[PDB]
Design a protein around this nucleic acid. Structure first.
Lengths: 239, 96, 192, 239, 192
RNA sequence: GUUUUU
RNA sequence: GUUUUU
RNA sequence: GUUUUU
RNA sequence: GUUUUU
């Protein structure tokens, strides 16, 4: 029998930094001690929230449209600013620009939050232009996008990813930008997404009882392949 | 139960009456108004008992607690010549 | 085949119900999913499973410290501001910076100040001087859901230190949550 | 053989706050070390206590009747006070009040203890009115209860949870209040339970050899669905 | 069906034996049991399984400290005052606040003062300075049951510190019990 | 509630 | 290399 | 030497 | 004494 050896408590070596507290790995925090009377769990009630289940993934929120650099008043510079709230006019000639600006994720309310949370990301971005005109107004508008561009200057969109918008019943037009960068993941708050330009293709037509100019709204969201990766410090403070 | 139905209504009419659809508010949008301006708003849920002429006003009086679901129908009519867009959104107490 | 709806032509007034994972295509484009890590960093459990600074308190005596605990409008935890209601376990990370003593720590969602006078009933884990502990407070909330914004969205934290001599110090606090249940996402926050 | 690696004691990382003592979770305290000679357990003797088994659940005690705001003398204000010891009189007219007050859990000896122990609770509350009259006395008395009420004022009980009491052989009358609050659990020592009113329905009748007024006692206990949840600090000190 | 007895009409003089779980109903009411947590917080083992402050002692020297241990009329432990007799394991939580030294701790139900002179036989676990231990004292009681009220309902606690230099300090004490056996519930206590 | 992990 | 221990 | 414990 | 937990 093992009576040739005196019985003893197990001896173990304690690794470096015992007592060190890891506030980075979730696998570490979830295992923390419980101040609960019996280290028990509670029964959650989604109904009171009107939901059938909790919200598990945040990416889905990044996939929700939000106005770009939204303002109370339309672009007072013929749309050459970041305001995603500009006017299209009977006055503007074809090839004239109704909007132009360099796009960044922070220009979007929902996205700007992730920009201040995660350090990198990847995936396609979707922009939806909604022109609110009357049933009589007609015309076309081509909006292109040069991925990764930086020179904020009007330029032919023949080689850019563009979408021609013909006014009808569904006056909301989408444009997808697939992920385009040297790196596999890209800074959330780094290099611009590219040059966004919406040029006039065919003058907005009208009649005696219809407006000679209409309002437009530009929204932005992440694609179904969107992803965010490293959480980083904050660059701004919300309220 | 009146077998002759001198009242041709569903027997549970009076019961469901308070859940009936009602006019909660009306307002005239002014053309001058800027984007993001608040057109109109309705206190939820006390608005369904807005006046003593509300089907639900009766019962609502005899109870202090309420748990209900809503079905809104915001209506805005404008001739074809005109254009524009409004944002109809529900704002829980947290948002408000 | 592909419909014109999935090619960009749509109507903003036909988006309800909320949450439409509609696919968007073009001749040379298709949604491509590429994962760089073995797991997601977007999942609520993972992201929030990582703490973030909250506040610091300097104590020259044992007087008790009670502070409302709320969601951050500052760190990566700000992603919570996108929601309206919360419920679940709450991980509290406390560091006791002192030479010689002990730190009583307790957590309660109860708004009453008096209930916290006798700290022992509440919890009061003990962190010896120079040590840091991570206590996971359960959802002992008298309210089924915690509006995520409230200056007291999270329950109050209590810190009373049993010092021994003239020794004094400071108590830094960090917060994180275990498996969080968020509901009814609200509009994105503004900046200061 | 594993002789290509030198044999070693296991190495382990020590989590944050080693030596920290958890005085909140029972699962923690029950595992504490034993100062027992052989870390042994004793044989308990219930018989000496006249019992066949120990007492395992405290809720059962909360389910034991106790007089509300008990006093040595009956209500000297026609029962408009918290005293659950009032008099019913031949003199009082119908609809006149014999008792009225706002009810709180602390108004009950047994319950007040839980109020000073737990922070929240839930479940129905049962009040039992015991009118001690002679076999000749007859009459009725309606006691209602407006859950969650705060305005201490006499009011028609037609819409309140009431119980009509007709004097007979069993002159103890019960009234149940089912749990009524916005929250799933409710503060043990918070908002009132409601307005408790006992109005006269039919004047207490009598004869030459019977009393013209009798004594009444109001007791309170928790329902079979009663529960208490979080233990909190104390708001009072017992003796 | 339902009898008039279960509808509120009863007689107070027909309640014995003690402990009648009679159901009470009305047309729109039925006893509904809803649980918010995976377990009970009313069970004696759980509630009392959580400690509560007892008392504190400041020591300027090794002199021994013996204090009667009794049930609290102050914290959540007061719920014990609803009972008359107790028996079972006793968890004692001691914190040694000192710079350099050791604290001898021992527990005995024996009323004799002399038996505690030689502390070693009794127990005397050792808590190094700045450390806190939780010792579970068994029911080595010469009495089958402990009247729950007695100024010494719980056995006496002994604390002697083996200091090294002029160092001094204070010893805070907390108490909790492991699996408690309470019997013959008595009337509720009064307030001060 | 696979709501630590597979 | 049972050269940690059986 | 069940001479740690069953 | 499932009287740590299932």
């Amino acid at each position: 029998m093992s009576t040739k050896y005196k019985w003893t408590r197990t001896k173990i070596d304690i690794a470096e930094g015992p007592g060190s507290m890891n506030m980075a790995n979730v696998l570490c925090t979830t295992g923390a001690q419980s101040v609960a009377l019996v280290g028990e769990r509670a029964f959650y009630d989604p109904r009171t929230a009107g939901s059938k289940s909790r919200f598990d993934d945040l990416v889905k929120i990044a996939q929700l449209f939000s106005v770009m650099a939204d303002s109370t008043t339309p672009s007072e510079n013929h749309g050459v600013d970041a305001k995603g709230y500009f006017k299209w006019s009977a006055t503007t000639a074809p090839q004239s620009i109704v909007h132009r600006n360099i796009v960044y994720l922070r220009l979007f309310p929902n996205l700007n939050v992730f920009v201040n949370s995660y350090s990198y990301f990847r995936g396609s971005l979707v922009l939806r232009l909604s022109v609110y005109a009357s049933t009589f107004n007609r015309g076309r508008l081509r909006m292109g996008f040069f991925p990764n561009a930086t020179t904020d200057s009007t330029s032919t969109l023949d080689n850019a990813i563009y979408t021609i918008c013909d006014i009808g019943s569904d006056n909301s037009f989408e444009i997808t930008i697939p992920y385009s960068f040297s790196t596999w993941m890209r800074k959330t708050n780094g290099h611009p997404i590219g040059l966004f330009q919406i040029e006039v293709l065919n003058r907005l037509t009208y009649n005696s009882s219809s407006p000679s100019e209409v309002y437009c709204i530009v929204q932005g969201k992440m694609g179904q392949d969107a992803r965010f990766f490293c959480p980083t410090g904050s660059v701004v403070t919300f309220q | 139960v009146d077998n002759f139905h001198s009242m041709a209504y569903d027997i549970t009419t009076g019961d469901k009456n308070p859940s009936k659809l009602v006019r909660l508010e009306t307002h005239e949008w002014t053309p001058s108004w800027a984007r993001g301006y608040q057109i109109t708003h309705v206190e939820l849920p006390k608005v369904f008992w807005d006046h003593q002429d509300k089907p639900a006003y009766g019962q609502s009086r005899y109870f202090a607690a309420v748990r209900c679901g809503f079905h809104f129908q915001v209506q805005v009519n404008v001739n074809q010549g005109t254009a524009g867009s409004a944002l109809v959104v529900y704002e829980p107490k947290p948002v408000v | 085949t592909m419909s014109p709806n999935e090619l960009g032509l749509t109507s903003a007034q036909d988006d309800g119900p909320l949450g439409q994972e509609k696919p968007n295509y073009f001749l040379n484009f298709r949604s491509m999913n590429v994962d760089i890590f073995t797991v997601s960093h977007t999942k609520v459990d993972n992201l929030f499973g990582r703490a973030w600074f909250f506040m610091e308190h300097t104590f020259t005596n044992e007087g008790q410290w009670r502070v409302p605990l709320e969601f951050p409008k500052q760190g990566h935890g700000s992603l919570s501001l996108l929601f309206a209601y919360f419920t679940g376990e709450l991980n509290i990370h406390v560091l006791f910076l002192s030479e010689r003593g002990f730190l009583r720590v307790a957590h309660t969602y109860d708004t009453s100040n008096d209930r916290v006078n006798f700290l022992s009933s509440n919890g009061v884990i003990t962190v010896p001087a120079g040590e840091q502990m991570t206590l996971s407070a359960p959802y002992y909330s008298n309210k089924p859901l915690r509006t995520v914004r409230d200056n007291n969205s999270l329950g109050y934290l209590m810190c009373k230190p049993f010092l021994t001599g003239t020794s004094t110090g400071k108590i830094e606090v960090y917060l994180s949550l275990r498996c969080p249940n968020f509901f009814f996402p609200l509009p994105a926050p503004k900046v200061t």
